[PDB]
Amino acid sequence: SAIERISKAAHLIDMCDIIREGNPSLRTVAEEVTFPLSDQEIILGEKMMQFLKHSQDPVMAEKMGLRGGVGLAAPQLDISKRIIAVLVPNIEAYDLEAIMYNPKIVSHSVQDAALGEGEGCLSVDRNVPGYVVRHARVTVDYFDKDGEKHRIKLKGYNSIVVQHEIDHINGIMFYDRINEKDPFAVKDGLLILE
Ligand SMILES: OCN(O)CCCc1ccccc1
Numbered sequence: 001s002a003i004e005r006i007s008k009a010a011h012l013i014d015m016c017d018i019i020r021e022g023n024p025s026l027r028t029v030a031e032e033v034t035f036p037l038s039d040q041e042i043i044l045g046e047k048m049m050q051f052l053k054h055s056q057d058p059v060m061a062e063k064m065g066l067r068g069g070v071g072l073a074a075p076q077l078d079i080s081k082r083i084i085a086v087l088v089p090n091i092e093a094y095d096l097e098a099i100m101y102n103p104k105i106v107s108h109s110v111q112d113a114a115l116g117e118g119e120g121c122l123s124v125d126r127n128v129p130g131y132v133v134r135h136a137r138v139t140v141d142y143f144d145k146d147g148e149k150h151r152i153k154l155k156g157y158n159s160i161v162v163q164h165e166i167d168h169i170n171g172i173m174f175y176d177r178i179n180e181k182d183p184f185a186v187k188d189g190l191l192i193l194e
């Protein structure tokens with residue numbers, strides 16, 4: 001069991017725990033978690049966040065052969081649960097740090113946005129150029145490990161990152177939102193971030 005081994009106290013998540021394109025799990029819609037959460041579901045959230053921090057540490061990422069990341073979704077660990085972790089650094093130490101259970105976008109702006117540099121994915125071993133078109137702004141509802149409900153409004157990079165992870169729990173990949181015809185086309189109402 002993926003969640004079983006990953007939740008072991010001694011286990012440290014690394015690239016070998018992350019599945020890549022081709023694995024059906026990434027195109028499957030993750031199942032919602034029920035409350036109260038099991039101890040394993042809470043630990044998994046914590047393990048995920050620990051992974052993000054490790055991936056962001058120079059020495060850690062190096063020793064563990066980790067690809068840097070600011071977000072991670074359970075499906076990427078072959079665990080089909082609606083659980084995601086986000087850790088966006090400020091340029092406190094973080095612009096956004098959260099472990100979200102059953103996250104859901106309850107409202108979004110008409111205006112769209114996309115990173116000028118485009119996007120990458122820990123489960124995708126290749127570069128796919130293009131603007132990943134997303135909602136500029138979103139209001140997201142989610143539950144924390146204690147089952148408490150949170151409603152937040154995101155913009156800029158945080159908005160992009162959370163949408164990328166929520167897409168994972170819905171079986172969607174970043175390149176699914178890039179314009180096939182013109183990967184770098186700038187449509188009306190599209191806000192390029194940079
Ligand atoms: O699932 C997360 N992951 O593969 C790491 C990439 C996170 C990310 C990077 C740039 C723009 C949006 C999201």
Ligand code: NI
Pocket residue numbers: 120121122123164168
């Ligand atoms: Ni990804």
